[PDB]
Amino acid sequence: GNSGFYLYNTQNCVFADNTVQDILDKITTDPSLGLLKAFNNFPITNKIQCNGLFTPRNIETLLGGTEIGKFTVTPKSSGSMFLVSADIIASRMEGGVVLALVREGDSKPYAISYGYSSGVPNLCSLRTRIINTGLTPTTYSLRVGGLESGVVWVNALSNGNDILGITNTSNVSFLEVIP
Amino acid sequence: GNSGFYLYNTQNCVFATVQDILDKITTDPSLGLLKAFNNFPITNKIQCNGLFTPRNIETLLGGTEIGKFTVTPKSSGSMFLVSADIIASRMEGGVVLALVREGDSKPYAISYGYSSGVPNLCSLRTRIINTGLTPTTYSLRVGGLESGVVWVNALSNGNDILGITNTSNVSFLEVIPQ
Amino acid sequence: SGFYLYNTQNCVFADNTTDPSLGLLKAFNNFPITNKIQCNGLFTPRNIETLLGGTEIGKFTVTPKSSGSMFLVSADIIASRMEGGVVLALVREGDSKPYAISYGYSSGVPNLCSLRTRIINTGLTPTTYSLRVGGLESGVVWVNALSNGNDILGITNTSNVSFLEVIPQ
Ligand SMILES: [Br-]
Ligand SMILES: [Br-]
Ligand SMILES: [Br-]
Ligand SMILES: [Br-]
Ligand SMILES: [Br-]
Ligand SMILES: [Br-]
Ligand SMILES: [Br-]
Ligand SMILES: [Br-]
Ligand SMILES: [Br-]
Ligand SMILES: [Br-]
Ligand SMILES: [Br-]
Ligand SMILES: [Br-]
Ligand SMILES: [Br-]
Ligand SMILES: [Br-]
Ligand SMILES: [K+]
Ligand SMILES: [K+]
Ligand SMILES: [K+]
């Protein structure tokens, strides 16, 4: 109940009362998923004279036959295998052909197979499976020679000449599979 | 029309998801991402006295059994791609191979090979149509074409080839048709 | 401080499963060949790099499901001929010579003659291939039959050509 104007020090004042990509990277790089599988095919087109023999004395060493190819492969999944197919065009005077797949570091062949030529070229095959031991590149080589005796030519007639006058192709394929 | 001060009642106032897919993908048989593989090595030497003839080719009695294999598909509506790669010798002549599915009364698939006397690879390549996800058994029989004795994994006299044990293989790879 | 007029008014104042690019998705096709075919066409140095060598025994159409894929091809043909060489050639439609050539053998009795290769796919479109078989230089070759054209073991036999899609490294 009071109102008006008044001085406060020096002021005159009024006053008053008022996710797809994320899978994709996993899938293409996670080795533990059994998805995803390496494949490699290795053509062999050169004519190779295989003078090295296979015999009981060298069959369990590295010295049997003649090397015709060397292959490096890498698994993309853990605990996998490679299903291996070697299909080699070979000729020899009537007799047996031996094939040996060797894994680098071992002291003898990983797998041995047998083929035949009558004198004219014939496919000689090795089919096997490799047990992979990690995700590291691994190198394998294929050797080919006569069974006990004879010279074997790969990709050529028994004298070394071109079959049918052309270059021919033998193949070694590796297909990764999960057991 | 006014300014000043006034009383109002008593007041004086102024105014103026990844794991969820991954479990599916790694276990669902209907998607077709899961593919079985099995390889069966055969390393024993087996004398195959049983023959294949027109009278026994469509029975279970042709040739001699060299292996029996049990496999399980992981996907529905799948097939197995089969490769049997058998080392065999015989005196000059033909070799017959027959894959039999358990329960059937004759071979599923038949193939042919050759030996001149020295060992040679004899193969059978086929595809099997799978009918569920249950283990299934198959067997491989080998014998002469019409006549002759066939040795598997051995020379024509039963001895070791090159003095070692040799390996024949039968592989089954699961694949999905289109 | 006080009150004053500002204009008219009186105022207070104061100071305060379908993506091809992955690639899961792998086609498989198998083509059984069960007819007996008398392959009178020969392979010679003069026809080996043409379309005319041998005799066609099958034609296959396949479709890749993934990009930058290959088909792993296996042709496993039952064949007989009087003592000698068998030649197989896989041809891709539109080419003017074989994509791959392989060799087999018969002594007179049937034997498996194989061709194993890989094909490089170039898209996701159906593509047609064919297989041709014939003698090496001379001789008649019978597919799925004895060297005289009769049934082997008195039954129908089956040769196969398979295509399996795979993805290279
Ligand atoms: Br490749
Ligand atoms: Br020796
Ligand atoms: Br052969
Ligand atoms: Br296995
Ligand atoms: Br009979
Ligand atoms: Br059985
Ligand atoms: Br049946
Ligand atoms: Br022995
Ligand atoms: Br199919
Ligand atoms: Br047909
Ligand atoms: Br064509
Ligand atoms: Br061309
Ligand atoms: Br017969
Ligand atoms: Br694959
Ligand atoms: K021989
Ligand atoms: K090596
Ligand atoms: K012969």
Author numbering:
A (entry chain A): 2 to 19, 100 to 260
B (entry chain B): 2 to 17, 100 to 261
C (entry chain C): 4 to 19, 109 to 261
From the reporting publication:
The protein Pgp3 is implicated in the sexually transmitted disease chlamydia and comprises an extended complex arrangement of a C-terminal domain (CTD) and an N-terminal domain (NTD) linked by a triple-helix coiled coil (THCC). One of these, the Pgp3 protein, is transcribed from the CDS5 gene. X-ray crystallographic studies of Pgp3 from a genotype D strain of Ct have been reported at a resolution limit of 3.1 Å by Galaleldeen et al., establishing that the 84 kDa Pgp3 trimer is comprised of globular N- and C-terminal domains connected by a triple-helical coiled coil (THCC). Recently, Hou et al. reported that Pgp3, specifically its central region, neutralizes the activity of cathelicidin LL-37, an antichlamydial peptide secreted by epithelial cells and neutrophils in the human genital tract.
The protein was crystallized using a high concentration of potassium bromide, which resulted in a new crystal form with relatively low solvent content that diffracted to a resolution of 1.98 Å. A total of 28 such ions were identified. These are basically all in the CTD. The most common form of interaction is via a hydrogen bond to a peptide NH. Of special importance is the lattice interaction that is observed in both crystals involving the three Phe6 residues on the fairly flat NTD surface and one of the Trp234 residues on the curved surface of the CTD.
